[PDB]
A paper describes a structure:
[name] (SLC26A4) is an anion exchanger that mediates bicarbonate (HCO3−) exchange for chloride (Cl−) and is crucial for maintaining pH and salt homeostasis in the kidney, lung, and cochlea. [name] also exports iodide (I−) in the thyroid gland. [name] mutations in humans lead to Pendred syndrome, causing hearing loss and goiter. Here, we present structures of [name] from [name] (ssPendrin), which is 90% identical to human [name], in complex with either I−, HCO3−, or Cl−; ssPendrin in the apo-state; and ssPendrin in the presence of NFA, which inhibits anion transport.
The structures of ssPendrin in the presence of I−, HCO3− or Cl− were determined by cryo-electron microscopy (cryo-EM) to an overall resolution of 2.8 Å, 2.7 Å, and 2.5 Å, respectively. The densities at the S1 and S2 sites are at ~5σ level in both the Cl−- and HCO3−-bound ssPendrin structures, and the densities are at ~13 σ in the I−-bound structure. The overall position and coordination of the two anions are almost identical in all three structures, with subtle adjustments of coordinating atoms. To functionally corroborate our structural observation of two anion binding sites, we performed 125I− saturation binding by using the scintillation proximity assay (SPA). Nonlinear regression fitting of the data was performed to obtain the EC50, the Hill coefficient, and molar ratios of I−-to-ssPendrin binding, revealing that one molecule of ssPendrin-WT can simultaneously bind two I− with an EC50 of ~10 mM, and a Hill coefficient of ~2. In contrast, both tested ssPendrin mutants with either impaired S1 or S2 anion binding site exhibited a molar binding stoichiometry of ~1. Whereas the EC50 for both mutants were comparable to that of the WT, the Hill coefficients for both mutant variants were reduced to ~1, indicative of the loss of allosteric binding between the two identified anion sites. Saturation binding studies using 125I− support that [name] under equilibrium conditions can bind two anions (e.g., I−) simultaneously. In all three ssPendrin structures, the anion binding sites are solvent accessible from the intracellular side through a large cavity formed between the transport and scaffold domains. Thus, the structures of ssPendrin are captured in the inward-facing conformation.
Numbering used by the authors:
A (entry chain D), B (entry chain C): 17 to 39, 64 to 164, 176 to 585, 654 to 732
Write the structure that this text describes.
Amino acid sequence: SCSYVVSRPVYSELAFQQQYERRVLKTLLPVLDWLPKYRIKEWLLSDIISGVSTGLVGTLQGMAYALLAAVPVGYGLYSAFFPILTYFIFGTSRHISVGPFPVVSLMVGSVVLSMAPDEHFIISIDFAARDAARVLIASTLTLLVGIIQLIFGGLQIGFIVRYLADPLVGGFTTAAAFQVLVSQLKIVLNVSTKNYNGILSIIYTLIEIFQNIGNTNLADFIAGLLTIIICMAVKELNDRFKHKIPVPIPIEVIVTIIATAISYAVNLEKNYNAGIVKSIPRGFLPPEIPPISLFSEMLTASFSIAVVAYAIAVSVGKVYAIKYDYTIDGNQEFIAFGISNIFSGFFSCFVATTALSRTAVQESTGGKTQIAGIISAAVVMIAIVALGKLLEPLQKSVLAAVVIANLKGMFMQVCDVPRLWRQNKTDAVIWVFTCIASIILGLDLGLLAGLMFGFLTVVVRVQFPSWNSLGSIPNTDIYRSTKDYKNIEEPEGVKILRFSSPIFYGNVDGLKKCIKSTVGFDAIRVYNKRLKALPIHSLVLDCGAVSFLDVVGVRSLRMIVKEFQRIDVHVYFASLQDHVIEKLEQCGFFNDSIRKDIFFLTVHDAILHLRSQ
Amino acid sequence: SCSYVVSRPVYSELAFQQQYERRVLKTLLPVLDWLPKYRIKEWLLSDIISGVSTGLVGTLQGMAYALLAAVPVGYGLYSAFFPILTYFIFGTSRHISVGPFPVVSLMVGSVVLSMAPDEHFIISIDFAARDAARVLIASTLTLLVGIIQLIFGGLQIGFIVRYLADPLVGGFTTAAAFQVLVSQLKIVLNVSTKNYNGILSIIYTLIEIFQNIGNTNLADFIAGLLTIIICMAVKELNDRFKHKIPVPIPIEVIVTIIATAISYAVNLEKNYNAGIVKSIPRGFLPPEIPPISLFSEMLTASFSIAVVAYAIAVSVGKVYAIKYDYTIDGNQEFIAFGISNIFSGFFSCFVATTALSRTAVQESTGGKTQIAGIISAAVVMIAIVALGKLLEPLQKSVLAAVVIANLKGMFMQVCDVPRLWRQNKTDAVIWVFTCIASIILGLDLGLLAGLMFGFLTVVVRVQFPSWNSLGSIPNTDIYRSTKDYKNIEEPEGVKILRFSSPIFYGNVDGLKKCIKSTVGFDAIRVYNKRLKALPIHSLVLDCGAVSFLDVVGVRSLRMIVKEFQRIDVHVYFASLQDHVIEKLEQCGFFNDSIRKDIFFLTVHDAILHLRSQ
Ligand SMILES: CCCCCCCCCCC(CCCCCCCCCC)(CO[C@@H]1O[C@H](CO)[C@@H](O[C@H]2O[C@H](CO)[C@@H](O)[C@H](O)[C@H]2O)[C@H](O)[C@H]1O)CO[C@@H]1O[C@H](CO)[C@@H](O[C@H]2O[C@H](CO)[C@@H](O)[C@H](O)[C@H]2O)[C@H](O)[C@H]1O
Ligand SMILES: CCCCCCCCCCC(CCCCCCCCCC)(CO[C@@H]1O[C@H](CO)[C@@H](O[C@H]2O[C@H](CO)[C@@H](O)[C@H](O)[C@H]2O)[C@H](O)[C@H]1O)CO[C@@H]1O[C@H](CO)[C@@H](O[C@H]2O[C@H](CO)[C@@H](O)[C@H](O)[C@H]2O)[C@H](O)[C@H]1O
Ligand SMILES: CC(C)CCC[C@@H](C)[C@H]1CC[C@H]2[C@@H]3CC=C4C[C@@H](O)CC[C@]4(C)[C@H]3CC[C@]12C
Ligand SMILES: CC(C)CCC[C@@H](C)[C@H]1CC[C@H]2[C@@H]3CC=C4C[C@@H](O)CC[C@]4(C)[C@H]3CC[C@]12C
Ligand SMILES: CC(C)CCC[C@@H](C)[C@H]1CC[C@H]2[C@@H]3CC=C4C[C@@H](O)CC[C@]4(C)[C@H]3CC[C@]12C
Ligand SMILES: CC(C)CCC[C@@H](C)[C@H]1CC[C@H]2[C@@H]3CC=C4C[C@@H](O)CC[C@]4(C)[C@H]3CC[C@]12C
Ligand SMILES: CC(C)CCC[C@@H](C)[C@H]1CC[C@H]2[C@@H]3CC=C4C[C@@H](O)CC[C@]4(C)[C@H]3CC[C@]12C
Ligand SMILES: CC(C)CCC[C@@H](C)[C@H]1CC[C@H]2[C@@H]3CC=C4C[C@@H](O)CC[C@]4(C)[C@H]3CC[C@]12C
Ligand SMILES: CC(C)CCC[C@@H](C)[C@H]1CC[C@H]2[C@@H]3CC=C4C[C@@H](O)CC[C@]4(C)[C@H]3CC[C@]12C
Ligand SMILES: CC(C)CCC[C@@H](C)[C@H]1CC[C@H]2[C@@H]3CC=C4C[C@@H](O)CC[C@]4(C)[C@H]3CC[C@]12C
Ligand SMILES: [I-]
Ligand SMILES: [I-]
Ligand SMILES: [I-]
Ligand SMILES: [I-]
């Protein structure tokens, strides 16, 4: 059919260049962006129902996630109230529900516990002073996270969540699910376990839990087990029986209400000594300035918490924006969430982000603009000021059981590891390394280690590329690996090397080794042997995949050219890009008899030029 | 002249594949490697003179570098004696002199001081107990460094010194020169400065030195100043007046001998209260087992010290092996230096490597096999057992002044910085970052920060590549950037994108943005708009520079292909390598109507195929 017919001069870089010559209302996102653009006629009612539903869900979610953080139940209500109010202004996303997201809450609680242990703080037991210190530490960490997020918004470096690769995100998610399960399993059993801060901490906690399982509160354990079973069964029924009832079943809220009513009717606090919350303040606490002197002990934790929370927020926002066909500004997501975390930290709250389950609840029940968020915040507020007393008899085991039941989706990511291994071993290695690191480390330290391991994998992949010795398909200009096709004909007296990577320090050492192996000799050795006494005449370097080039790369290429020219062997570079040749010429490569006449467009001009001599 | 004439079928990947089918005496390096091959007839005498000269230099260097480490003078003699003996066996290199190399000594001393401060150890002043503790800490660190080096030799991962890029090596060298200068300036002034451990430590030390400059010992300062001046003057004369006297002038040894004799004659210890060494033990101390319990506090320091010492050793070994036309095994350099550091740590020595000045002295005075090293070790031994008393009146200011005088070569790299900036800004950024980090951090922490910053620079360079929209030179098959050559003709209804980087998570986000900008529209947006209602017909991706590919890359490519096919826009991949296509097919790319018929050999088969329709 169609044919590849081309007739043109043999163009080196010099000849080709001679013939073809080269050469104010967003950083503070207004509510006025959509409030005048609102649809009160029909959007308002949908926003009302969506906000009521997601507020009912988020009040419970904040109460439960206040257990992940080492703060008393009641400050989760503030963490579910204030950030939504202060995100309604600066938020690009219009479908996400702002709240604790128990992974971020667990990291905050780890930081708070490490900075306020039971034995280190209390020598009496002073529960009130300990709780005050824990709340202050959580507020300080939230303020630092907000400061970091706002700074990253000013720097406009919103691509950092790119560095959170999907394999390491999955591994970190599985490890965080394990950590959350261990903490909430400590909570449901109502066992007293001394806090372990450091390496292997989750294993120490599990060991102590298995040792103290004899002190398990029976009523709390049964309540947690039944809550887990009921929530899981109803979730499975909803997933299976999904054709009807498009709205998800709010099983967690119903179970919590039933548990609270039963505990109030039976008085589990004193008859069975169940671990009820026992303390939910009524009213709004006045703002306080967090002690910034602790910022030095929270930097590595605040950075990772900010990164993780922002990544979750933008992930959910993008998932719903592609569905609803709009865009979200990542830098403005920085700005909004940093302002939110600063505002919440001034008001005794832990770090805030979005939760996938709460966002799904908000969207599925008539998801519209952030007015639904305002309605949810109002519901949380009326829970704070009116329903605080009604939730006193609720056991903490029920909340921890709800969290554990929701942990199943995060736990099921271990099934992707064999698939990753079969597809790309590097990604499976990243997954496993991130999971293991986040297990035996802090979650913040695990995330940092995963990021560094991803960088290491990228560097290693660009450092040990696929290099080949090429030859031409007969009667064509297609140069393929000689040992791969069995019909490749080797040219007479010339070796062609394809080094499929940008050449840098690691790659300059690798490329020297590859050239020495391909040509079959070392230029230094043969030159020295010839000097002491006193098969290849040309080497073509297929540099099509050489992306960038550093000073070490230019120096190595210059040394290779000189060393091979010393033994009357010519080195020709082919398929180099314009920018790489510009980097070569600005690094002083074209000095001492180089003159750019040894640079050809592809690896067929070089071979044709050689055949002309 | 020569012409580029090719007549061949238009080959897609499918058609091309259908028509062209694919498919025990070294780990313990013996002295018997060269001892039977020795040249006693004429090599022995040259070895004798070379060993005598380099031993005279190395005794002084060991005593001087024992001040960089926080150990008494006399243990530097052991550090210059034992490692040479135990490297004569396992060493591949035959020209290097094994010893302290004051940068490694300074890192060891920083570790030792941070673990045995004056105030933390002594509450009386117990100089003897403090010195014993410092020696034990130095021996423990040396043993840990040797263990790490031996493990790295077992793993055969000798390419890690590749990761020590020349810019970061230069920045670390300049910062280490500054640190050594500050410490030896504290020593020469004989000022009592409390040790600062942590961040900004060198600036605190400089501040305290400038505050205590009123307590400077005048005699020690004058001795150090004249030692520095004489060393600089003689070195400059030797560099200039270099045609005669090929052997370098051992000015440091002569200066030390003269200073020792003058101090003995005048008794500066009592008359002028000069800071003489005052204590050099006579004889060999028995070996002791270091306390391994300190290994937990030395891991980050020992890793960096081992890496730096091995890098210096292999750098010097390669510099002299290329000159003398032989090869050195990097893994065996691990093995030899790990055994050396273990042996020396058992015998109260700090970490050992090679020094460029001492190696130059050994080589220039008749450099031959490591028998010269044995002679140097014998000279150090006879200095230990006989000349220990003769060096008692020598001031420490003379030794510190010798080190400061030798620091000039390390200091001269701020001159290399500006041309690095003018050539490759990334390498200059790496240089400056490594220098500043190693200044305000530990030297070990600075090295780790520089290595990880180099990894970050590689990741960023492969993450933000040079991408272009290509068009064809008329009547040829050369596709160049349309906005760069001004004679490029845009083809009808097709856009060609060259993304000059391997496609991974950072690059998948970048590539989505680049495709959307190049084609001028978003596939999701136009598809959604067309669904709501109810200029380019093909996109060619020049993937010549796509080196590797991950699961995220394959997912992004499938997503792009499907999104563009949904709007009747065909996506063709060109110039993909065989291994990248293998990765695509093993990652499930060729499912759901892909069939590999949209993959062409170069970006001219795709265009010719399009013109056929
Ligand atoms: C954007 C890019 C990323 C940015 C990342 C930023 C990280 C910042 C780390 C900051 C840092 C190192 C600085 C140098 C780091 C060099 C790294 C080189 C890396 C080379 C590749 C500061 O180090 C010093 O720490 C002192 C406290 O020790 C602190 O306080 C002193 O002065 C105060 C008055 O100022 C005074 O009030 C106070 O009394 C003094 O003590 C000092 O101010 C501070 O300088 C280490 O501190 C961090 O915080 C904790 C400290 O304990 C520690 O927490 C862990 O605890 C758990 C166990 O308990 C553990 O299990 C958890 O994991 C974790 O909760 C962190 O782990 C650590 O990291
Ligand atoms: C191949 C690639 C590189 C590998 C690098 C390997 C680094 C290993 C670091 C090990 C490490 C963290 C472990 C987790 C790290 C996670 C990193 C995640 C990074 C993610 C990107 C261990 O952490 C704990 O430290 C305890 C001591 O604090 C130690 O001792 C405890 O138990 C003992 C009984 O076991 C008991 O006897 C003892 O009493 C207990 O206290 C514990 O055993 C140990 O687990 C930190 O320790 C290292 O050593 C020092 C400690 O102080 C510290 O020294 C600094 O001091 C200067 C100021 O004074 C500072 O200015 C200098 O800089 C530096 O001299 C280092 O900085 C630190 O690093
Ligand atoms: C929807 C429901 C499951 C929410 C949780 C309700 C809680 C408060 C209820 C449900 C079932 C109850 C348990 C049922 C049976 C027993 C056995 C009895 O000898 C002690 C009380 C104990 C252990 C009860 C404790 C309280 C309990 C766990
Ligand atoms: C709290 C403690 C017990 C958590 C321990 C989690 C560890 C042991 C788990 C978490 C994820 C797991 C990995 C997930 C998937 C695979 C692939 C399959 O071939 C089994 C091994 C392997 C590689 C698993 C090994 C064990 C693993 C790393
Ligand atoms: C403590 C735990 C996490 C230890 C490790 C157990 C987990 C990770 C292991 C054990 C059982 C494994 C599963 C067994 C069988 C299959 C079928 C295969 O077609 C896909 C992977 C999948 C689904 C495996 C995924 C990894 C797996 C879930
Ligand atoms: C990809 C790269 C950057 C990951 C680097 C991870 C390193 C720094 C981490 C991972 C696991 C860590 C180890 C985990 C456990 C212990 C035991 C403890 O008693 C001393 C510290 C020590 C020995 C840690 C040292 C640091 C360590 C080796
Ligand atoms: C050639 C080199 C090696 C000689 C070094 C010997 C040293 C110890 C000698 C040489 C010159 C000497 C100085 C000469 C002059 C004075 C001034 C006097 O009021 C106090 C002693 C003092 C400050 C001497 C101290 C010791 C000194 C510094
Ligand atoms: C102990 C203290 C004084 C050490 C201080 C070291 C710092 C301040 C020095 C060391 C090397 C220096 C750099 C060396 C070279 C250049 C290039 C020129 O354009 C001046 C700026 C710049 C980039 C310098 C900036 C300052 C610098 C980074
Ligand atoms: C900018 C270009 C033209 C400079 C050309 C000469 C270069 C090699 C020289 C001239 C003056 C030098 C600077 C002079 C003073 C200092 C301060 C100190 O911290 C050392 C580095 C630094 C910053 C030097 C770096 C190197 C330097 C900039
Ligand atoms: C490329 C990567 C590895 C570089 C990482 C560098 C980071 C971890 C280092 C570089 C300089 C460091 C800072 C230097 C000085 C101080 C002041 C001290 O009171 C608290 C810690 C703090 C604030 C350090 C935190 C960690 C830090 C920001
Ligand atoms: I969730
Ligand atoms: I949940
Ligand atoms: I030296
Ligand atoms: I020296």
